[PDB]
Amino acid sequence: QGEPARVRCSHLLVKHSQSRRPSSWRQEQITRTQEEALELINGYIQKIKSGEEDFESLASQFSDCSSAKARGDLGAFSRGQMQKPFEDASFALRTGEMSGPVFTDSGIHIILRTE
């Protein structure tokens, strides 16, 4: 009750060979396994938690989503606009919180709720 109509999120996507589209601006063919993507995701999370790296800086360098060009920013979205697992994870975050690994048809994500 009272939920905001929209949230704004940045994310870092690591695709794998069973992503809906196993290709990105980084690689014409993404051949890593889902487990390898999860290992990379957990490595990125650790780098962010330790303060060695900034979330948006990692997303701009390493996210397999075209939103890497926007430093991970997807913009604001309402319910029904993102894939259900991503939507649910996003709306479950408090503003400024970062998720753990989120599994979608696109790959594995880290999500940072920015608004």
Author numbering: 49 to 163
Give me lines lifted from the publication on this model.
Pin1 is the only known PPIase specific to pSer/Thr-Pro motifs, which is critical as phosphorylation increases the isomerization energy barrier. Pin1-catalyzed cis–trans isomerization can profoundly impact protein structure and function, as confirmed by cis-specific and trans-specific antibodies. Pin1 activates at least 43 oncoproteins, inactivates over 20 tumor suppressors, and downregulates global microRNAs, acting as the “master” post-phosphorylation regulator of oncogenic signaling networks. Pin1 is hyperactivated in most human cancers and correlates with poor clinical outcome, whereas humans with genetic polymorphisms that reduce PIN1 expression have a lower risk for multiple cancers.
In this manuscript, we report the surprising findings that ATO inhibits and induces Pin1 degradation and suppresses cancer cell growth via noncovalently binding to the Pin1 active site, as corraborated by nuclear magnetic resonance (NMR) and co-crystal structure. To explore our unexpected noncovalent binding mode of ATO to Pin1, we co-crystallized excess ATO with the Pin1 PPIase domain and refined the structure to 1.6 Å resolution with excellent statistics. We noted well-defined novel electron density in the prolyl binding pocket of the Pin1 active site that was trigonal in shape with significant Fo-Fc values at 4σ. Although anomalous signal at 1.0438 Å was weak, isomorphous Fo-Fo maps calculated from ATO-soaked and Apo data sets showed clear density for what appeared to be ATO with central arsenic density peak >6σ. The electron density was nicely situated within the Pin1 catalytic active site positioned within van der Waals or hydrogen bonding distances of Leu122, Met130, Gln131, Thr152, Ser154, and His157. This model of ATO binding was consistent with the degree of change in chemical shift for all backbone amides in Pin1 revealed by NMR analysis. Again, neither Cys57 nor C113 were close to the ATO-binding pocket. Notably, ATO titration did not affect the cross-peaks for Cys57 or Cys113, further supporting that Pin1 binding of ATO is not Cys-mediated. The Pin1-ATO co-crystal structure predicted that an M130V mutation would disrupt ATO binding, whereas an M130I mutant would bind to ATO like the WT protein. Thus, the M130V, but not M130I, mutation in Pin1 disrupts Pin1 binding to ATO, as predicted.
